[PDB]
Each structure stands twice: as structure tokens, then as C-alpha cells.
Amino acid sequence: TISAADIEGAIEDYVSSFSREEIGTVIDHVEGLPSVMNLDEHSVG
Amino acid sequence: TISAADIEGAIEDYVSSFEREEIGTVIDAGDGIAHVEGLPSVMTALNLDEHSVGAIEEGQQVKR
Amino acid sequence: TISAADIEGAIEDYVSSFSADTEREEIGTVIDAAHVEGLPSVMTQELLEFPGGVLGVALNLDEHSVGAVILGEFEKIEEGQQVKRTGEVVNPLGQPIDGQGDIA
Amino acid sequence: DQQLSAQGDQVRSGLESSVDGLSAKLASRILGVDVNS
Amino acid sequence: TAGRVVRITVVDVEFPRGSVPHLGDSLVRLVRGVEV
Amino acid sequence: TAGRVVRITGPVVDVEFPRGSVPELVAQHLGDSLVRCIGLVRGVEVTD
Amino acid sequence: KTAGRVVRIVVDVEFPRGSVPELNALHAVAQHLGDSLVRCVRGVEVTDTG
Amino acid sequence: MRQQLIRQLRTGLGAEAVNKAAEIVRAHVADPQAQSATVDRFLSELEQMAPSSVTSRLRAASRQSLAALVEKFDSVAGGLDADGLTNLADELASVAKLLLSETALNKHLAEPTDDSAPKVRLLERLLSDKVSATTLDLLRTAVSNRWSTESNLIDAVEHTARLALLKRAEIAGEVDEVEEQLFRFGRVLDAEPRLSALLSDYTTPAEGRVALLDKALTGRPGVNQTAAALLSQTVGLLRGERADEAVIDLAELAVSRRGEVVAHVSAAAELSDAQRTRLTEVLSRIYGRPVSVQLHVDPELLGGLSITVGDEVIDGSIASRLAAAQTGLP
């Protein structure tokens, strides 16, 4: 019952469903700016 | 499960709920320093924060 | 003169004696490197076997994992490997390193 | 050692003949039921 | 619009969002809870 | 009413007891019913 | 796929489960930190030579 | 120097002989009769094997509180109807997501306190009428007790929700169907780490991930409805656990409710019905309590079985025997 291709349809459909300038916010350290050039998954030093 | 801003009032009510004496509970105690949960009204008990009060056996009742 | 009789016998006896009976065993998994989750009954200082014949000793025990010091070839240890417990607490292990042969 | 090396090269060829029996016995053992091959 | 003391170590005060006068979550670095 | 070893860090041994049975000073009370006392196996019963 | 991505920047790289490089050279491995991370712009693809 | 040469002869002869033995084994076990015979011999060994005398993450407070809450659910859920159970699960999941979203409310509802009356009053004032009476009772019981951390609270609630669904599955009588479906979903999620990662990211909105799960592999024609609902509910409330691990936990809990233990049996090929029954009987005898057996198929085993229950493994895989022979050389 599992095709392994309909999974691809759904996953890339969702990824497309996600798709603006990225703006970071100061937490105390800046959150956001995922594409910024002390970096870690939480914030930016 | 629609939740309006009543929460904000409700918590305040809860915040006010806790004439009876204020009893704390020792949460840990070592090296001569204890930590007491509770006693929301305790005055400055050296270190105070949202969790505990940094002033013996765990679970003992602490008078304000 | 190296008679082939002993040459072949040294392996014939081993083959005729090989019996790797399946033994109900308690295992764990390397979570980082090495720390091993599982092995609930591992003794402190117990000897642990990691794949590739690597040997470790369980020093730090706690609710999450077991810290194990690897006794050589640590580069072979990978996250997710299976760690067996030996149930028991010349290089320091007694294995000869000169190469002159075996030891009783 | 040249005599020893020659002895080794001779005996390895000599014992290559019996490898079939040893491997067959080992497979017999690690299969539980003996394999004729 | 009035803050309140949360830790008394130095005193940390929590303020309503947008009213922060900065440890994050609106906190900024005596009885706990007294309005500031 | 008897504890059980939870951590063995060399001589140090963190032992967990039921709620109302925590022994008195066992070199330290870590809280949450654990105490830090000074071939052991995690889980072995510890008697006060 | 089976290519990791930079997480923290010493650079931490997160790989798909079952594709963690051995304690290896990577192009944008010092430790296995668990949860398929290893320690050696966030999110840039990282490949392992093997 | 002579014995040095002898040792080189030993290693060379052993390596070549074990390679020949490995080739012989692989050739001989390709026949399905050989596979079945190997499995039968290993099962025989298993009967000959002696019996074994012998939510861990929860600490003392969390574990005891969860025990109390599950007992309360057992009490309340006695005679509730299937539709009532679907409801109750829905309200419990909604309240769990509420607690997760409202960090302040969870925080205030988390701290232990000698008096539980203020917490009960808070819950009643919050959602006295927004959810049925049984949900009120269960939530009141959950908040009355203590939790080591605030997180455990929501965990407990989530647990109840799962239980409720499982209960209606039991009421449906298709517990086996839901357990099998849950295990299959866990397998496919583990095989496709990308799908789990895209589902295992709470940062994205839960509605989108639930829709993705429904459309990808959960809205399929041949999927048990209870299993689909349980998996969707689990992913919706997900906190950061790996989705595949969450599904495995769901299946393990489902088997636990029946009082059994999951045994992950890995085999070279599928097993016969008689072999399956024999394996279940022997594993139950060894471990005492009844065990449900989940079959993985992996050709690399070459034969035999590799059972594992709890943190214990019985590795009868032929490939393991070959590896032992390789390492057992002088």
C-alpha cells in the first residue's frame, strides 16, 4: 500500500507550500537570520 | 478548545490565591546551603528567584 | 623443517572445536564518542566489547548512559554501534606484543 | 631465513590442498547440519 | 505597563511585552513580585 | 522504603529513595528524593 | 542525499541517521555528539568523502 | 623466527579457510529449505535455552503522578462508549496542545504544591464547560499530583489521549490491526528519515504537518482508521521527539496495554505460520509474560534469527556465526 513516490509528491508539495527578506530579532543575541554568514541553531552571537 | 484572554485573568486569580501561614518546602540541601520552594512573600534567604529561595532534610517545612 | 601436519592441525582442532552457541546477551548502543545507553546491569569497571574487537571499561554510570574508556583503536567506535557486556571486571591486558608466541 | 622462506612457500602450497576439508568442516559446524561440500 | 521583581540576587524585573525599559522574555537585570 | 543506586561516579554514588524515606545527612541532598553518598550495579537496593 | 548540513559555527554538522561519517573529511570529524551530529552559513550542505 | 613464520601460516590458512567456509554457507543457504532448517534448529536451541529470571525517563514524582493518572483513566473509562472515547481523546489532545502553546499556563500548572485546590479551581474556571465532564475529571487528577518537570504534565495528558484511542480500538476489537499498522508506519518512517524530519519539526505549523501525514501515507485506502488517528494525533502534539521513534513508542504502548512485550525478530526471510507460533511460544516461555513478535526481513542475516526484547538480544544469525569464526582464528 506504500508507493514511496506519493511521499515525494507530498513532501515537495509541502516544501513548495512554504514558498521575503529575512529579519532577525534581538533576544537579549539575534534570533532568525537563517542565512547569516558565533552561530548556532538557537541564535547568533 | 477555544481559549480567550480569560487565562490572563485566571492566572492572576491563581497568583492571588497563593490569611494562612506561608510554608515552604526544602527541595535540596548540601554544604550548608538549602533551597526552599514556596514562600512567595519571603523578603530578601539570600538568593530569591522564580523557582526557589537560596538560604536540614529534603521535604522539611520551612516557616516564613 | 616445518611439517605440514602441525600446520594443518593447529586449524583443524580449532575448526572441530568451534561452537558459537547463541547466548542470551544484554547490549547497549553508543550514543556519542564513548557513552553507551543501555546495559542496565553493567557493573562499575566492567569490561565492554565494541564492534571490531575494541575493548572498553565502564567507569561513569548514571541513569542516562555509561561512560566507557576505550582501550585502543578508538577510531573504530561510531555512534549507533552495539556494545556487549562481558560480565567481568605484554600489553596491559596481558596479550603479548613481542610476537614470540602465545602465553599460558 | 632464505631456507625458512623457501620452506614457507613450499608448505603453503602443500597445505592449500587440505583447505577444502577444513572449510567444509567449519561450514558443517556453523550450520549445525553438516554440509557435504 | 508596570514591571515586577522576579529574582533578587542585583534584581531582575519582568515587564509587559513592549514595555521593557535585557535578558530576553521581557526581563531586565525586597519581596519578589512587588511592582516596579 | 529502600533506595536504589542511580549513579556511580567513582566513590560518589547518587542513590534514589522513595518520597518519605530520604535519609538524613549521605553527603548531600540533591533534591527530587536523590542523595549523594560517598563492581557496583545501577539499581541495586540501598538500605537506610 | 546522505549529506549533512552545518548547524553550529569548530563546526557542528548534522547528518541523516545512518549516514554519520566515521571519526572523515567533509566539504562545506572530531567527535560524534549523538543525535547524528558530529563536531569538526548555517544549513549549507556538507558532504563526506568516506 | 620459525614460529613467526608458523604464525603467518596460521593466519593465512585461517583466513582462506574461513572465506571458503563463508562462500559454502552462502551457497548452501540460498535454498529456502536451508533457511527453514536453520530457523528450526535455532528454535530448538531456544527451547533448550533456560528461562530469564529478570517510561523509564520519568523520575520519581513524574512516574508516580503518571501512575495515578493512568489509574484514574482506567477508573473513568470503564463504560464510556466508543464515540465518547473518540471525543475524550480529542479534548485531551486539544488540552495538551493548549498547555504546550501557553507556556505560562503550563508553568503555573506545573509547580508542585501541597494544596491542589487552587489548581483544580484554575482548571474549572478555565475549561469547566469547554470539554466534557470526564475530561475535566482526568485533567483535575493530572494537575492534583506533582511532576518533576512541567513537560511531564503535557506528556501525561498526551498519554491519556493515546490510551483513550487504544481503548476504543479494543472496543472495536481490532487491536491487532492497529498494532500492525502502527509498526508498519514506524518501519516506513524509519526507512524514510526525510519524512520524519519534515514531520518531526515542531517549528512548522502542526496543521500543515498533519495534512502532509494524511496525504502521504495515512490517508491511504488500506489504513486502519484508529491507527491513522493515533498517528496523526501523535504528530500533531509532537514536542521534538523523532517521528519514527514516536511511532515505535505508540506501538510499544499499544502492545503494553495488552500486557505483552514486543519482540523484534529479525530473519533472513519470512517465517511460516507454524514457525511463528513456535517462536512466540518459546519467547513467552523464556520471558514468561506473553510476547508479540514483529518480523524484520534482512538477507544479510543469511539464516537463523536475531531476537531482541527490552535491552536483551539473542543473536542466532548465521552471519554472526561467520563473524565469530572469522574472529576466532588463532
Numbering used by the authors:
A (entry chain C): 5 to 23, 28 to 36, 43 to 51, 68 to 75
B (entry chain B): 5 to 22, 27 to 52, 66 to 76, 85 to 93
C (entry chain A): 5 to 37, 42 to 97, 111 to 125
D (entry chain b): 130 to 166
E (entry chain F): 8 to 16, 19 to 30, 56 to 63, 73 to 79
F (entry chain E): 8 to 32, 53 to 65, 72 to 81
G (entry chain D): 7 to 15, 19 to 32, 34 to 38, 53 to 64, 74 to 83
H (entry chain d): 109 to 162, 169 to 444
Q: Which sentences from the paper describe this structure?
A:
As do other ATP synthases in eubacteria, chloroplasts, and mitochondria, the enzyme couples a proton-motive force (pmf) across the IPM generated by respiration to the synthesis in the F1-domain of the enzyme of ATP from adenosine diphosphate (ADP) and phosphate by a mechanical rotary mechanism. The mycobacterial rotor consists of a membrane-bound ring of nine c-subunits, attached to an elongated central stalk, made of single copies of the γ- and ε-subunits.
The PS is a key component of the enzyme’s stator joining the external surface of the α3β3-spherical component of the catalytic domain to the a-subunit in the membrane domain, thereby helping to ensure the maintenance of the contact between the membrane domains of the rotor and the stator during catalysis. These structural elements form three separate domains. The N-terminal “b” domain is similar to those of other bacterial b-subunits. The δ-domain is similar to the canonical δ-subunits in other eubacteria. However, a feature not remarked on previously is that the bδH4 to bδH8 linking domain can be superimposed onto the δ-domain by a clockwise rotation of ca.120°. Therefore, the δ- and linking domains appear to have arisen by a process that involves a gene duplication event at some point during evolution. Thus, the bδ-subunit has two structurally related domains and each binds to the N-terminal region of an α-subunit (subunits α2 and α3) in a similar fashion with the third α-subunit attached by a different mode.
